[PDB]
Amino acid sequence: LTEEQIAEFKEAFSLFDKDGDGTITTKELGTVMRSLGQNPTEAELQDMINEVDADGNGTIDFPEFLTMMARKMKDTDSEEEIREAFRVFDKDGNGYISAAELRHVMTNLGEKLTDEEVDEMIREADIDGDGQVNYEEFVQMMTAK
């Protein structure tokens, strides 16, 4: 995480940590959201806290806030990159990569596959057997560790 990022996250934390004690509680989170409209319930509030409280100690600290903000930024970044990667293949933008599309993409990028190898590449990813690669199928390819 850059200084820039941390500093944005510092401000975001401050907004919720009304008293500045380094910790965000449910009362605090209510008071702030009410200072701003919102009107949520002690149910809603307890959950929001639990979803982020890694150590279970009952409130959110900056380290835990930071982990949550990092994950969400990384998650979104990945999603947007994978969508972009998909468009490099899905030439006509219809949501499916056909064998024909893959083959011509291969030629454009200066790669060298035979037609049977193009088919292997489609089959590899084609979880549902329709003979094409949709977006979720593609994600598994780009996610492979």
């Binding site: 975001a12 919720f16 903000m69």
Partner: peptide
């Protein structure tokens, strides 16, 4: 909610 409010509320609702 407008986007400004939405951006704030998502910090903790997302």
């Amino acid at each position: 909610l407008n986007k400004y409010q939405g951006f704030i509320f998502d910090i903790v609702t997302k």
